[PDB]
Amino acid sequence: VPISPIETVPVKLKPGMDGPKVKQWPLTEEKIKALVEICTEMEKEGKISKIGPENPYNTPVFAIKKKDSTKWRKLVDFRELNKRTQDFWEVQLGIPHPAGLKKKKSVTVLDVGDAYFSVPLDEDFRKYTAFTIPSINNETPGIRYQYNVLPQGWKGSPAIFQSSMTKILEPFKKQNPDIVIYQYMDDLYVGSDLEIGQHRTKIEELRQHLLRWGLTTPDKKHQKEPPFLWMGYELHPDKWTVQPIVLPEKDSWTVNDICKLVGKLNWASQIYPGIKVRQLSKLLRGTKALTEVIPLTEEAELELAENREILKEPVHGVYYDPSKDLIAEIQKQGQGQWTYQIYQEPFKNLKTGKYARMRGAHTNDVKQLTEAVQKITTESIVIWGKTPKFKLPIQKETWETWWTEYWQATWIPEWEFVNTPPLVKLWYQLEKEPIVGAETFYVDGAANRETKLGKAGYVTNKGRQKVVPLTNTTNQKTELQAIYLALQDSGLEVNIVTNSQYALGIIQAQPDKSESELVNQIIEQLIKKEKVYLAWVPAHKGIGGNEQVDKLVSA
Amino acid sequence: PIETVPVKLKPGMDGPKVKQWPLTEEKIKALVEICTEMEKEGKISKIGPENPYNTPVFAIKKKDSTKWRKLVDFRELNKRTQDFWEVQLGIPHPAGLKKKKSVTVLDVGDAYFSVPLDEDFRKYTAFTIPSINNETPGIRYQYNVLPQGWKGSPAIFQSSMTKILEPFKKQNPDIVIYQYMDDLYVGSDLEIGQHRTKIEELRQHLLRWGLWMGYELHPDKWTVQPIVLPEKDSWTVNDIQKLVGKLNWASQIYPGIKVRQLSKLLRGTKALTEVIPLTEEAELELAENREILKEPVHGVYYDPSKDLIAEIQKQGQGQWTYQIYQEPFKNLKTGKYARMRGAHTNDVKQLTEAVQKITTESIVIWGKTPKFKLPIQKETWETWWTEYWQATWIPEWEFVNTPPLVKLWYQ
DNA sequence: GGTCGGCGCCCGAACAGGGACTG
DNA sequence: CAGTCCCTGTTCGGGCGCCG
């Protein structure tokens, strides 16, 4: 067997474990013909070699159809191999995005062939890549091969190819520094600001530099004229857009279906602004069978129809211009949902997106807005390496009020206010000092761990009082209920004294939404008030009426 | 031609496997230039995917410095080699360093590039350089010399360092010199003028052996933040309720605290804004409790076998309080920072500055870095903290969310 | 078909750590 | 006292998309 022009990556197994020894699956007669035809072709080219009984290893093998071609792809079920091989550190840290490309004079795209089959495997590792090819007869012993290149299906094949490919491009990139080469596996986006004459020369220089290592650049996959098909997009000299997305039109929707629907809606949200998957993801909660057919709710059918209405119109993105600033603007789409657009010139979106994660049982719009800014910041640094300037639907004074008074550290990068309703605001403000002339409510609540019964009420300085029996409750729900009562039976200005750190920690965080209906009722009463002062006192210390109301709600 | 000191991980543990976070453009361009240069000087060499280990990498600019500096987050590697730099080749901590009138820090990380690393240990010093928009896959390297920011580097170089410092320690015996990581702490009771000159004498004393920085500290002027009670002449119900709650919380630190006579002032269901006169038994319980807060807590002392822990509280208006302890309510030191960089505009910058000051103080006093309890959400911190870091070490931290209880540490 | 790697989303289940009360 | 229970937050396992 000849020597391959690329240096080989030494691969070991995990210490103490032997190679795989698994029996072959029974294969359909149409797949055996496709395998023997492709096996017999690859041993002629030096990519697989025969092995005898001295190889005690074996692993299953099969084949799937190629998309839009009569050719078959050979895949090996290396699940038992991959368990015992050494771990690899993948060098693909993410996926490039067209919004990060810069306008270049000339653009060229190519795709090499038999990529994994043009890179050799380590000599001492080929023995563990032994597999059997079942013949048309079950009594035939079958032909046993071992791989000489990176087997499609092994966990180290992508990792080894990406690193070997970069090593071959380094000498070219070192000689041609002004040439931009986006390397993602077998696809090479090449662009330069050189004139179109000396462009094609450097292209030819690359196709010959890659040829010296057994990497073929077929003219079938060579692309010299716009538009270019790169990473599933359409690159034009001034704009770009995704390749057409097709949503299913099922009359009867299954769970799995929603998942392909939801998956493509998230993929479309990167340039199609305003995609919502709130009501469609509400169909995937608490379901067990990927196939338990599920009827679409009224809110989900509306959400689907809106999304179909956004996909009819054509949209496109632009490229990144380093000379001008990066801008990102956010809107409050719905309750728990957010959208944003990143651009440099008005209405010329580099890309869009959405954020809708519910973090915590109690939150407000300001928290979610801060979470959204951070998600945009990280994503922007991935693609452009810088933080955009932000246009936020929150008043400057609103944000200044929040971050200065919040006990956690919180911050938003350089931003400016944009008057786009609905505006994010704080729905209520707790006073910092007790209110003069306002009735003072000493609240408490308790419950029984066994009976699940409890009381909750208050005692005031004007003699007012209430105690309410509660069934199927906890100690925490009662201390919250006691505050709800004081809010109901008080005027517009009220002072409230509790001994509940749990209740006080939730309210001071100024939430406007909650998963607990009792909190939402407390919020609704807090918005109706003009001035509210909360205070904490230690319990069981004989403080004011807090000990008097502790003895009333004891049982 | 120097012999390599053999190093091994702690038993039954693999190398670090931490993903590289996204980096800005100004950082990636700085790492490329440095790494190609360090590759050209043979300090590092490119590797491949067969190395399953990786450590995050980013760049910093020290306070009032224009040149970039490569920094590696070997916190995970240092946790996994802890038995080396503590048992075999430990460094003593001079208890007199914190008593000096002026202490100066010097980055000596460039010297570690002169000593080769153990061949079998280079596999764990692996790191990856990302690219903007993932243009190219990760450009991986590994260290072929003593890496900056690794706990095992100053321990191997300790024998070489002491021999360089002996001619200077002999001429100046009253000068205290401590080495922690890539930094060198030199403290002296000399006047500020002749102190800086002796620093330059050292600097040229290290330039002749194959090695520059400057950051001055004054540990004798480090103050602590005690728990203080208000001196009001007219007390309202709310004032007394806040006072009892704060004194009740302080009772976990000073057991001698009593709130019996003050709670008696809170018997009736009175309005919060109503003015209450202090009884004679309460005015004495208040004055006695003020004296207990002047006394030091009984039974507090540093334990070298225990890990330090630091808590930070945001007090607003650029005020930040902190406490260092090993066992709860046994605070080795308390304090308060005000007017740091980014006050009144950035809380992450202030929180980043406060951690650095606290860590620096922990190195001067005990020679350890505390594990921080940061008052910030995890996602907020991990997004911005690298933009304000100006130090060669990185402490450990965790994220807490303790609602303000009462104002124990700030009036 | 039921290969590999990367990144993203959505969900639930398992994990985990602190507070109040009881044991 | 040490044990729960109540609550809340995080981490991971598993589905889809997209790319190769």
Curated annotation (Swiss-Prot), chain A:
Effect listed in the UniProt record for changing residue 402 to L: Almost complete loss of RT p66/p51 heterodimerization. Complete loss of polymerase activity
Span(s) of short sequence motif Tryptophan repeat motif: 399-415
Consequence the record notes for mutating residue 502 to R: Almost no effect on RNAase H activity. Unable to replicate. Completely resistant to inhibition by BBNH
Residues of the site described as Cleavage: 441-442
Effect recorded for residue 442 to W: Virions contain primarily p51 RT
Effect of residue 168 to D: 16% loss of DNA-directed DNA polymerase activity. 24% loss of RNA-directed DNA polymerase activity
Binding locations of Mg(2+) 1: 111, 186-187
Reported impact of residue 111 to A: 5- to 12-fold decrease in affinity for dTTP substrates. Strongly decreased RNA-directed and DNA-directed DNA polymerase activities. No effect on RNase H activity. Loss of pyrophosphorolysis (reverse of the polymerase reaction)
Positions of the UniProt region annotated as RT 'primer grip': 228-236
Site positions per UniProt: Essential for RT p66/p51 heterodimerization: 402, 415
Localization in the cell: Virion
Effect of residue 513 to Q: In strain: Isolate PV22
Record-annotated Reverse transcriptase domain positions: 45-235
Reported impact of residue 230 to A: Complete loss of RNA-dependent DNA polymerase activity. No effect on RNA 5'-end and 3'-end cleavages
Outcome of mutating residue 75 to V: No loss of polymerase activity. No loss of RNase H activity
Effect of residue 185 to I: 54% loss of polymerase activity according to PubMed:9533880; increases polymerase activity according to PubMed:9657675. No loss of RNase H activity
Effect of residue 168 to A: 71% loss of DNA-directed DNA polymerase activity. 61% loss of RNA-directed DNA polymerase activity
Effect of residue 443 to K: Almost complete loss of virion production
Record's subunit section: Heterodimer of p66 RT and p51 RT (RT p66/p51). Heterodimerization of RT is essential for DNA polymerase activity. The overall folding of the subdomains is similar in p66 RT and p51 RT but the spatial arrangements of the subdomains are dramatically different.
Protein name: Reverse transcriptase/ribonuclease H
Residues of the full protein shown: 600 to 1153 of 1447
